[PDB]
Design a protein around this ligand. Structure first.
Ligand SMILES: Cc1cc2nc3c(=O)[nH]c(=O)nc-3n(C[C@H](O)[C@H](O)[C@H](O)COP(=O)(O)OP(=O)(O)OC[C@H]3O[C@@H](n4cnc5c(N)ncnc54)[C@H](O)[C@@H]3O)c2cc1C
Ligand SMILES: COc1ccc(S(=O)(=O)Nc2nc(-c3cccc([N+](=O)[O-])c3)cs2)cc1OC
Ligand SMILES: Nc1ccccc1C(=O)C[C@H](N)C(=O)O
Length: 449
């Protein structure tokens, strides 16, 4: 039937295309101006990691080829630690599995074009303000001030981590929200193609410079430049009041000092550091959990609107595209919007909750320069079991990243798997001491195919 979608980011535009193909009258409203008009700007140039999960959703929409055409392939993770040979941990035990680096703005344009080619009407320069649920009315506003009321039948809030739809819903039901804040902010920097080729930075990998309480990440672009993200506390905790934070970094020069002392091997590749640091705003992170994502058959949330998460597993978009697929499936196969929205929430909620936890946990893996003898021993054993039983023992990263297993099933399995490894490894100094066959027997006993 009819649907009104608020937000033409990743979730909203994908879901609009799918509803529009399956014969829905679709209207998508977007606060921002159409980004497809050509200008003299270079842009923000944000990079996102697209995994098998998200790529699959795009495959379902018939958009995979177009998106992949502009993606840079990442074959492994490259971990840079000073006084160390930058070691490339490939993705898998083979190299069929990959992660793609796609420019966020390219992706969005592909998506918009795909939304319209399916029949969706997109309306830019219009932000949701309010929602009258009793009288089924929407109020939008344009920056020039004016207001515009539209009726609606189904409302889809795909309007991002500060969703106004979610906010409107909260006015009329209790969403049981729990906000968990992240002490890290982030800041976007760049490594130019000039700098990139000079340092022989491998373009075809994900780069990370771990630093404990803070770290940098780098995904590459078609032009061989890299987009770089610094995760750092906003403020130093009470305990260690001298530790690095954004507060102490009060201009490019303090920032350059910070980088030259703490990231000596990364700093010389960051030519425009001072500029980037003063102009680009410091971003905030948070995990937000809701018990309910819908109001009867009137309104549902998906993507970041429904479940903001920390970026540490690189799965936010991947999850959002997955949500879009699931929502359209439900809306299509259900007796009514009510059944469809409930059914959607019941399916996707557990998965949102699972990746939200896994992303929070992923921080410390990425962040520690030297892993502990325990984690390293477990990881060694886990690879060995992964070779011997690829139907049963699949490392959690791979379940999440390189597979389509529901996020919750990944979590549940990684729970059993890690338990297995922990007990196998305790009171052992290294693999010498561990009988592999006994461990394989336990893997087989404990983990269903
Ligand atoms: C630093 C950082 C790094 C990340 N890296 C990755 C990664 O590597 N891989 C990955 O999969 N995910 C990553 N993510 C997360 C990912 O970007 C998000 O989960 C994804 O963008 C969510 O998509 P969405 O459609 O639900 O929300 P959005 O993409 O934010 O889209 C909502 C759309 O909302 C429109 N909008 C907002 N408010 C209104 C309004 N009031 N009225 C009308 N329209 C509105 C927005 O302007 C936009 O058009 C990262 C996030 C951050 C912060
Ligand atoms: C909470 O912690 C864990 C949670 C889950 C697992 S697991 O069950 O999924 N098993 C395993 N994953 C790997 C693995 C292998 C190769 C590279 C990577 N990698 O992310 O770079 C991981 C090795 S063992 C292990 C854990 O270890 C502490
Ligand atoms: N894009 C990101 C942004 C911030 C933090 C991590 C990422 C990742 O790429 C996740 C990757 N799969 C990882 O295991 O570290």
């Amino acid at each position: 039937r009819q649907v009104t979608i608020i937000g033409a980011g990743l979730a909203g535009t994908l879901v609009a295309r799918l509803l529009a193909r399956n014969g829905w009258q679709v209207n998508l409203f977007e606060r921002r101006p159409d980004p497809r008009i050509e200008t003299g700007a270079r842009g923000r140039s944000i990079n996102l990691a697209l995994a098998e999960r998200g790529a699959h959703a795009l495959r379902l929409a018939g958009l995979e080829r177009e998106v992949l055409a502009e993606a840079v392939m990442m074959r492994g993770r490259m971990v840079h630690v000073p006084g160390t040979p930058p070691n490339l941990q490939p993705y898998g035990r083979d190299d069929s599995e990959v992660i793609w680096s796609i420019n966020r703005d390219r992706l969005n344009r592909i998506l918009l074009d795909g939304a319209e080619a399916a029949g969706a009407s997109i309306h830019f320069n219009l932000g949701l303000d309010s929602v009258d649920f009793a009288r089924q009315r929407l109020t939008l506003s344009n920056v020039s001030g004016e207001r515009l009321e539209k009726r609606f039948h189904l409302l889809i809030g795909a309007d991002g981590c500060n969703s106004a739809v979610r906010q409107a819903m909260a006015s009329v039901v209790d969403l049981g929200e729990h906000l968990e804040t992240q002490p890290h902010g982030y800041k976007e920097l760049q490594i130019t193609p000039e700098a990139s080729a000079q340092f022989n930075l491998e373009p075809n990998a994900l780069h990370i410079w771990p630093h404990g309480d803070y770290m940098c990440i780098a995904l590459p672009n078609l032009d061989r430049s890299f987009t770089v993200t610094l995760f750092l506390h906003h403020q130093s905790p009470a305990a260690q009041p001298a530790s690095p934070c954004f507060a102490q970094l009060v201009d490019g020069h303090a920032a350059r000092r910070f980088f030259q002392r703490q990231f000596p091997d990364l700093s010389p590749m960051l030519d425009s550091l001072e500029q980037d640091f003063e102009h680009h705003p410091t971003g905030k992170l948070a995990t937000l959990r809701l018990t309910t994502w819908h109001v009867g058959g009137q309104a549902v949330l998906l993507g970041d609107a429904a479940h903001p998460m920390v970026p540490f597993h690189g799965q936010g978009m991947n999850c959002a595209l997955e949500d879009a697929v699931a929502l359209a499936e439900h809306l299509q196969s259900a007796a009514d919007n009510a059944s469809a929205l409930a059914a959607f929430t019941a399916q996707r909620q557990p998965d949102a909750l699972a990746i939200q936890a896994m992303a929070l946990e992923n921080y410390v893996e990425m962040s520690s320069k030297v892993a502990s003898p325990t984690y390293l021993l477990e990881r060694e054993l886990g690879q060995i079991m992964a070779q011997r039983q690829p139907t049963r023992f699949i490392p959690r990263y791979s379940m999440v990243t390189f597979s389509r297993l529901p996020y919750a099933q990944a979590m549940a399995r990684g729970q059993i798997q890690e338990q297995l490894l922990k007990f196998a490894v305790a009171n052992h100094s290294d693999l010498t001491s561990i009988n592999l066959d006994a461990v394989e027997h336990e893997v087989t006993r404990c983990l269903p195919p």
